Amino acid sequence: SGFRKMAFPSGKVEGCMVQVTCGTTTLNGLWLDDVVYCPRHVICTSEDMLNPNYEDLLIRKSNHNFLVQAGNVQLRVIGHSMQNCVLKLKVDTANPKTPKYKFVRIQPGQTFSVLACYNGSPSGVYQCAMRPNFTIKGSFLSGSCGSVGFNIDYDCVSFCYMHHMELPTGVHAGTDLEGNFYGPFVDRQTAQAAGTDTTITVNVLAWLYAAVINGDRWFLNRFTTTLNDFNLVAMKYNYEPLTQDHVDILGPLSAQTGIAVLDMCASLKELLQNGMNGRTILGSALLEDEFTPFDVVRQCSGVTFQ
Amino acid sequence: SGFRKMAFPSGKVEGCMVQVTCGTTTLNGLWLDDVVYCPRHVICTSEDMLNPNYEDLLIRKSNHNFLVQAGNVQLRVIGHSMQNCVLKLKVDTANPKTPKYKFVRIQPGQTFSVLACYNGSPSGVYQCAMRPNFTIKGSFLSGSCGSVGFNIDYDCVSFCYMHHMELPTGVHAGTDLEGNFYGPFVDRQTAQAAGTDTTITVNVLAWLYAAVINGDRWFLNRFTTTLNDFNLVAMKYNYEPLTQDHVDILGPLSAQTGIAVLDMCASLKELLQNGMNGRTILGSALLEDEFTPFDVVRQCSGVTFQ
Ligand SMILES: *C(=N)[C@H](C[C@@H]1CCNC1=O)NC(=O)[C@@H]1[C@@H]2[C@H](CN1C(=O)[C@@H](NC(=O)C(F)(F)F)C(C)(C)C)C2(C)C
Ligand SMILES: *C(=N)[C@H](C[C@@H]1CCNC1=O)NC(=O)[C@@H]1[C@@H]2[C@H](CN1C(=O)[C@@H](NC(=O)C(F)(F)F)C(C)(C)C)C2(C)C
């Protein structure tokens, strides 16, 4: 029983983390085989921050301008190249702690664990979701850049996020491990704002199923709804549109509970109208949207309380 | 900026988790030096757990009766003994991945990270608080027993919890690593209930300081109170007494924010009496009590461990 915002065990990612210094700028690197991946803005100065020409900044760099440190051991850079918004540093040593890995670009609503690091050293691990507006609600301070988001499937670490910047609203923006930003953001200190955020409807429905699996049913009602009527109401509370794809993905959780997806949709529709009335669901007074259908099936029972 | 429920990096513990099998029962073990620590009820059959005599059950067991599996290698047991509610299995090999560590017994309201494991394999990591009623609000299915709770002190892991059982309210009970239960519980399949819990007042105030640091301020007030008037209100809402210790411990947060402890106690008093008036604090509609003063200072000032 119980339900937690559970993170993946971080050990496979800790083993990859390095410190990268260019001039006075220090941030975190990801060391996989004989390549260190980091945010390209490690090569920026204070004057460069607004309108950096990265190609012009990089061309003035030698390999020995990059100081890469794995623990107290200095790695030796034998090559550098830029791919979109990531710097790729070729080093003379393959990381002996390299896990089975792959680079995946995730879609809004997808979750992952973040290993917040400073000076290539881990500070903590927490669970995040890619917001519909392509931000994450992270916990990042100075020196956290190059921190990475990941999932783990058996022994394989799928890297999906590298941290670049904080937006005015206190929310975070970053790239996949191929250096392409999520959302319309750019690695410049020019004025940028996150678009108005929405609630991840497919995830709230999953979390309500988790509540039923763990034996809570108070929020259920005797109603159903059409997919369209649900979306017309849901959009009025700043909820993501629920697609047929989302309904298909909730199929397994429907079967385990015996509650049709659109029956669960009628329950959510009621909760948005009524609030909580001093009650909680899985120890929350808000509808939680940072658990995916996969997260629920992973953490929850094959059986239900019932 | 940003504030997240953050676990310690789990890598140092991932390297210590093994699978322990006795007859048909399988659960998780902690492999440190040449000793494997696990719940003593691994020697029990499903029907022995009714009224187990662990003294009697163990004296009938031999070393080869304990199948201990680290990854793909079977370890050989050269001795077995009980300490309170934990079984200690002497093995042929000192764990080469053994971190610097100690066994620590924690107080209610103190937090730790739990590495959830199944068949000696880490599944997930989350942050917990020792409840005042000596339970944890964990997330545990069948086979999670022997999963451990820990804190990291620079490079030293302090082991504080071993998972033993789930109460009918869906909360969790276990021991320190010396096999002494937290709370009035016994490792028997007999009727047992969690005592009425209470809120950890020092943690809520600490969390309000984190909210202030991260720019959420609407709940502050011009009033002050005395400790004694606050505790009169606190106990009315089943909040823990706030001692002078607590006020001294929130010292480093009070000066750094410029908000006096008893002024923040005045803000808390108002939140309990009035509720939150449709508003949230760090994206929560409840008062969070699972962040310690130390936790807030540590996340908000960055950090590293080795
Ligand atoms: C990496 N070490 C930091 C991480 C930041 C610092 C505070 N919290 C974080 O997540 N990243 C940066 O310093 C990036 C970096 C220059 C400035 N920057 C920012 O995050 C800034 N924000 C923006 O420029 C904005 F608004 F456009 F997003 C800052 C004002 C410092 C928060 C570059 C090259 C984008
Ligand atoms: C260890 N692998 C499990 C973990 C449990 C299983 C369900 N969720 C968990 O957290 N521990 C147990 O199976 C322990 C074990 C016998 C019974 N038990 C329980 O957790 C049971 N509860 C109680 O005995 C109670 F209520 F008294 F606390 C159960 C009914 C299976 C939930 C022993 C020896 C205590």
Numbering used by the authors:
A (entry chain A), B (entry chain B): 1 to 306
Quote from the publication.
The SARS-CoV-2 Main protease (Mpro) or 3C-like protease (3CLpro) is a dimeric cysteine protease responsible for the cleavage of the viral polyproteins 1a and 1ab in 11 sites, including its own N and C terminal. Mpro substrate recognition has unique features and is specific for Gln residue at P1, hydrophobic residues at P2, and small side chains such as Ser and Ala at P1’. The absence of similar sites in human proteases together with the importance of the enzyme for the viral replication makes Mpro a primary target for antiviral discovery and development. Herein, we evaluated the effect of single mutations in the active site of Mpro from circulating polymorphisms on the kinetics and inhibitory constants of nirmatrelvir and ensitrelvir.
